[PDB]
Design a protein around this ligand. Sequence first.
Ligand SMILES: CO[C@H](O)c1c[n+]2c([nH]1)[C@H](O)[C@@H](O)[C@H](O)[C@H]2CO
Length: 437
Amino acid sequence: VKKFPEGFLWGVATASYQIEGSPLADGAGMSIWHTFSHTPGNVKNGDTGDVACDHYNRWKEDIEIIEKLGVKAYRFSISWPRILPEGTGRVNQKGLDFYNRIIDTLLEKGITPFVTIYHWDLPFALQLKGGWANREIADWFAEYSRVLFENFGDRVKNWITLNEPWVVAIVGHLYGVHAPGMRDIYVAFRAVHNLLRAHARAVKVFRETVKDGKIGIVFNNGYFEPASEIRAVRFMHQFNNYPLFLNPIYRGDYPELVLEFAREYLPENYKDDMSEIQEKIDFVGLNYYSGHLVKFDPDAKVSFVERDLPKTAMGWEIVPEGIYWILKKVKEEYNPPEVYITENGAAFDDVVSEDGRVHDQNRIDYLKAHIGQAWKAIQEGVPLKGYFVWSLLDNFEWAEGYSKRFGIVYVDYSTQKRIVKDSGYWYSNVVKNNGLE
Ligand SMILES: CO[C@H](O)c1c[n+]2c([nH]1)[C@H](O)[C@@H](O)[C@H](O)[C@H]2CO
């Protein structure tokens, strides 16, 4: 058997725009994902977050699912424009009420809330002012965060400033594939920098406002391997994984190969902000899904090489030892006091059999394998305090729309019926047992 430490936090994870629907209900401001998805060509099948999982109405049912599964922590995000419709200034009490009900319900049922402050749904009003491109976002984000701390910090004690700032900056402002849908390398790296400054200002406000909680930040990570017998792998790690942000946070500068590729794109006096950026954090959240074979390619001088390996419906290579690797490497490089796996999961072509069940043995195999590799890292001293399945529900998968299903619970979108998948039942047993058998 593989048993986890006593008090280890088994969770599931969602994000506001992906599950809620009703983006304009009860006085909410538009977000950049509302305007991005309502722009033709941006999202597969013209899908939007207008309805999604209707979690905005069905929130109590979904929490009852969490409870019934015996899952101990719930990671969810707050929609900034439900709280502050113009991004700053006015506070919307109905936005606060919505999350207050979710928070109290969780606590009442003994589920630990993990709140992601920003999971990509920036108020549109602030995008008009430059969004992440604008240095003033450090103030806007701090003011938003202060509101959340004041209203919920009595109850929520576990906070995440940002989900995947690399994706926010690069995918949103260089690749143009995510909101706000831009393609400018100089903008993209000013967003990287400003995300760091906004994060640190929010951590600083947290210390003034919530004297009894913990705060961290979440990063996407891939397991990169070299196609042969390696610097391209070093680059991909420093650029795509946690070092892009953790080197500034812990060592007060960007990683070396990031500076080689991108120095010219960063502000000229960016080191002036580095000492504020080193605001002390309580934990690092690492998201992990996939491995990649990498080679130098002259024609960022890196290309991916396809491998004949099992893949998910995203076409992502299933590489479980990656989660062990990234856990080891974070300890070795930055030694944060706590680590959580804040997302791990897989998309498969889920079908409801005529027995009424969803026989996702592919997902069970995926999760089991990665949970085992996370166990290993704990045995070798990684201070891993928790693990979160992405996702509780099938949901709006950004530019893929509804076509990719990551849930341990199946959502039939024509009825909004929730059907717990085999993987959900399987995970419930793991949580009950506090590990694998
Ligand atoms: C780029 O990092 C990860 O591949 C990643 C995967 N995922 C994520 N990040 C995001 O945090 C979620 O909002 C996605 O729904 C989820 C599934 O795609």
